[PDB]
């Protein structure tokens, strides 16, 4: 769920406030369309697409599904007790969190005008 994803981000990128990734480019947060503006945005595009794919699973609601995971000593792990939905969503979140940690953060790309720039 989003709370868990927030925690994944807090654990792979403790140097930023989680909310720095909640409204960035065309895909991080709200958004879900247009040209990814940079590598961080591309991380979010893959994440968004990953969620859309997980939503094909019956009863699978990525913002809400509580999965089983651990963030310890620099590593994120999706646990074996996860059903197909939980495993898929956890993987989406894990990969995105790792992606965020390796992407440059451009302040100019925070809170961009989606209606104008993400068509
Ligand atoms: Ca999004």
Swiss-Prot record:
Gene3D superfamilies: Phospholipase A2 domain (1.20.90.10)
Cofactor binding note from Swiss-Prot or TrEMBL: Binds 1 Ca(2+) ion.
Disulphide connectivity of cysteines: 11-71, 26-118, 28-44, 43-99, 50-92, 60-85, 78-90
Pfam families cross-referenced by the UniProt entry: Phospholip_A2_1 (PF00068)
EC nos: 3.1.1.4
SUPFAM superfamilies per the UniProt record, alphabetical: Phospholipase A2, PLA2
General function of this protein: PLA2 catalyzes the calcium-dependent hydrolysis of the 2-acyl groups in 3-sn-phosphoglycerides.
Protein name: Acidic phospholipase A2 3
Organism, as annotated: Naja sagittifera
């Amino acid at each position: 769920n989003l709370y868990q994803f927030k925690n994944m981000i807090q654990c792979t990128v403790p140097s930023r406030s989680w909310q720095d990734f909640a409204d960035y480019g065309c895909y991080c947060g709200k958004g879900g369309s247009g040209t990814p503006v940079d590598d961080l945005d591309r991380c979010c595009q893959v994440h968004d697409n990953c969620y859309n794919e997980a939503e094909n699973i019956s009863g699978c609601r990525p913002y809400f599904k509580t999965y089983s995971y651990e963030c310890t000593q620099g590593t994120l792990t999706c646990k074996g007790d996860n059903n197909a939905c939980a495993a898929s969503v956890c993987d989406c979140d894990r990969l995105a969190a790792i992606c965020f940690a390796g992407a440059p953060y451009n302040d100019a790309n925070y809170n961009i005008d989606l209606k104008a720039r993400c068509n």
